[PDB]
Amino acid sequence: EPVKDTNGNPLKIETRYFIQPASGGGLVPANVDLSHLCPLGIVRTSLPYQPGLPVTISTNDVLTNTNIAITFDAPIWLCPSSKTWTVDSSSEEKYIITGGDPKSGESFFRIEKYGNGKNTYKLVRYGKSVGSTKSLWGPALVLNDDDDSDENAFPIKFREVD
Amino acid sequence: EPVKDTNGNPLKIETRYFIQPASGGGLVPANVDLSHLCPLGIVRTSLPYQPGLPVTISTPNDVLTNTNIAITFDAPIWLCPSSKTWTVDSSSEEKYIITGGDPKSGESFFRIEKYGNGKNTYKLVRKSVGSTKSLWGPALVLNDDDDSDENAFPIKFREVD
Amino acid sequence: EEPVKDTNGNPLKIETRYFIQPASGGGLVPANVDLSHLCPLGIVRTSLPYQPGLPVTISTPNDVLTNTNIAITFDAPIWLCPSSKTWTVDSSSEEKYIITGGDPKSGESFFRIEKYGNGKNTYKLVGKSVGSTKSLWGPALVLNDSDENAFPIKFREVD
Amino acid sequence: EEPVKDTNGNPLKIETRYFIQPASGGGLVPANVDLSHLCPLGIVRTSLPYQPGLPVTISTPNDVLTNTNIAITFDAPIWLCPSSKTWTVDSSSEEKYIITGGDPKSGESFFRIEKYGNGKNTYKLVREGKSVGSTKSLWGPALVLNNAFPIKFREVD
Ligand code: CHL
Ligand code: CHL
Ligand code: CHL
Ligand code: CHL
């Protein structure tokens, strides 16, 4: 099944989208704690009209339950690593962090339908769903223990940036 | 004559708008230099899809051109001890527009006037509001005159839904 | 009403720079207490072992004596906040953080230096003693007299 | 190859903490050079007069001698960047900032301590040899590869 944006249109690669909580504003880079500034975690901004930092998806169609990479799109980057999402294996909390390799399997996630709402999804990694936990700046994306139910998943939509 | 938003609808008081450059993204609070963190200047973010921090307009519900208004940022968090209302830093050589003004005092009053080319395009006048290079990017400053649109920073108002 | 002494056993002088160093990381420095405000500033113990702290000068409403009204003012060539460098109590707060921006001549900014424990050149600030709580950067000074919950300090003369 | 001396005129030891302080603000510390990056870090003179600097240890690739390959490594219980505390040259900057994140065993991280001018116990760093100087950066003077930036070593404690 093709992933759809908030307008019900199918997701394309090489196309800028805000990832916005379906459940404050969009998802942005921020540090998870005071122990490291780089690499960056993924936090929901508490500011209501901030749309989030845009991402592009790499594989023109994006389909559900398929290996994809998510890369922030930004003209400025304060860290010496990449803008591609990945899992902090060395973190005892398994934060989703930047600095992944867009071609490597370390950076692969899958987009799956969430609950009933249309155009609502979750991310799953290999199967563990992406949830959230309290961090310094607010809720940060973390890898949950499993993907048995949507209970612990952080529901998202994709909004096309024009 | 009523000020209009990007949809051509007239501006209302107590209504959130993005002030967006007509000439990066919207206008946001940021420090102008390394000498002070508070109060805050008004900077154009270089990030292309950042809409700006919303403002509300007050009158000392219609907003009309060439009339005294106050501009106040709207935000659930504020890192400085002073107000979210725009004003002129009289004590700076640059005459930065800064936060921390009194919305009821005349120090915080600006006027919205039509700007050159393009529908629903405006400038602020107190002397027109222009911009200069600052630490984080272009910061709003009060110019010398309002003789022409040359030095004015053109803006539009986009309704926040 | 005996003189407060520095780590060299010399009596404290007014208008003289001292590091206030925890008597039990490095010295006391200005830092934000939480993510809700940058200004005004709280008083935090740096976790860095050889950072001496930001110097303060003491004023009196030349000896600094115990159990006497004094004001503490940070000494620095730059200040990123619009208010003063004088310590005071955040009168309306939960933890009653000690914060900058006080008036050194006003009673709002008065503290008293008293002996702490049965030790040597060790003190506390005070009815209510100055303690600490966990904050963003580390321990921050808060207003709590007994030396149970007091934050013990010493004074090191700066040269 | 004569021994480098600290501010007390005592010879420098390897694996010993020193402040590197400008020979005539306070000591040298890690800080960002500009708004383009937080990591890795530059080497800046703090403008605060009583800040001694962040301590370093010197390693040899127990006396530290002049005109010999040495590595400089900051010593700290915390580090906010994902790389090492060892000094090196930012080859891919036009300023050639001295930056952290070097390999203490690689030749990229080797400097030499040479006597500077007249003052006793005063030195410069050299990496044909190029001396370490300074340029204006965001917070203040930052060390760059080229006068030289004269330094002294103060024993911690
Ligand atoms: C590597 C350092 C880094 C840090 C520390 C942060 C931190 C933050 N980012 Mg991120 N980012 C960082 C890198 C990057 N970000 C982004 C892109 C974005 C976007 C698009 C957004 C964020 C936002 C946020 C904020 C999310 C929480 C919040 O809503 O607070 C509530 C908000 C505030 C308290 C206002 C903060 C104002 C100012 C932007 C930062 C404050 C300046 C002071 C230095 C604060 C430092 C305080 C210290 C003591 C902790 C948070 C301040 C969101 C945000 O709210 O920004 C306005 C947001 O929309 N970031 C990019 C791509 C350009 C980065 C590149 O390296
Ligand atoms: C009080 C201090 C204060 C400071 C220093 C800033 C600083 C900034 N604000 Mg502002 N703000 C501050 C107060 C507040 N802001 C806001 C609301 C906003 C909004 C909505 C936005 C800003 C944005 C900005 C940035 C505009 C420049 C840019 O385009 O960068 C390009 C972006 C970067 C260089 C990445 C910066 C990411 C991150 C937020 C952390 C930056 C802080 C650093 C870790 C510390 C210093 C690092 C240096 C070396 C870069 C700039 C970093 C804009 C922005 O871009 O934010 C993401 C923006 O959209 N501010 C509020 C209301 C809550 C404030 C209330 O106090
Ligand atoms: C709002 C302004 C302001 C803020 C946020 C701080 C914050 C801090 N001061 Mg303070 N200060 C501030 C104003 C002032 N300080 C000082 C003088 C001092 C001195 C002398 C010292 C401090 C120190 C500290 C630090 C204590 C915690 C620690 O031990 O970390 C330990 C060290 C680290 C965690 C490494 C990172 C340090 C780096 C300078 C912070 C970088 C900020 C991040 C890039 C932003 C990311 C923040 C995230 C949360 C958003 C803390 C970072 C102490 C310190 O440790 O300095 C290094 C210290 O010795 N301050 C003066 C007079 C000049 C100020 C005047 O305005
Ligand atoms: C991103 C990482 C990082 C950044 C941005 C800095 C930045 C700085 N360090 Mg460094 N450091 C950083 C990493 C680390 N430092 C250190 C250890 C030290 C030491 C021991 C010292 C520094 C000091 C400094 C300052 C030197 C310039 C000065 O004299 O300011 C003058 C001081 C001020 C202007 C007031 C202090 C500012 C306050 C700490 C926070 C400033 C951040 C702003 C509130 C946020 C907004 C930023 C601006 C751009 C809008 C400078 C602010 C020196 C210093 O002065 O600290 C107080 C210093 O003594 N650093 C360690 C080991 C723990 C790090 C590990 O990662």
Author numbering:
A (entry chain D): 5 to 27, 31 to 66, 73 to 139, 144 to 179
B (entry chain C): 5 to 27, 31 to 67, 73 to 138, 145 to 179
C (entry chain B): 4 to 27, 31 to 67, 73 to 137, 144 to 161, 165 to 179
D (entry chain A): 4 to 27, 31 to 67, 73 to 138, 143 to 161, 169 to 179
Relevant lines from the article:
WSCPs are a class of non-photosynthetic Chl-binding proteins from plants. Interestingly, different WSCPs are characterized by different relative affinities for Chl a or Chl b.
In Lv-wt we found a main peak centred at 1652 cm−1 and a minor feature at 1678 cm−1. Taking into considerations the experimental and fitting results together with the assignments from previous works, we can attribute the intense peak at 1652 cm−1 that is present both in Lv-wt and Lv-L91P to the stretching of the H-bonded C-71 formyl group. In Lv-wt, this component is predominant, and this could be the consequence of a direct H-bond between the formyl group and a peptidic nitrogen, as this is expected to lead to a rigid conformation, with a well-defined distance between the H-bond donor and the acceptor. The remarkable Chl b selectivity of Lv-wt17,38 can be attributed to the presence of an appropriate H-bond partner pre-oriented at the correct distance and orientation from the ring B of the bound Chl, as evident from the comparison of the two structures, to give rise to a strong interaction. Thus, the shorter 4 amino acid length of the [L/P]CPS motif provides a more rigid binding site, whereas the longer PVCNEL determines a higher heterogeneity in the surrounding of C-71 in solution, which can be attributed to a higher flexibility. The combined approach of X-ray and Raman presented in this study led to an update of our interpretative model of the Chl a/b selectivity in WSCPs, highlighting that the rigidity of the surrounding of Chl’s ring B in Lv leads to selectivity either towards Chl b when a suitable H-bond partner is present (Lv-wt), or towards Chl a when a H-bond partner, such as water, has to be incorporated in a sterically hindered binding site (Lv-L91P).
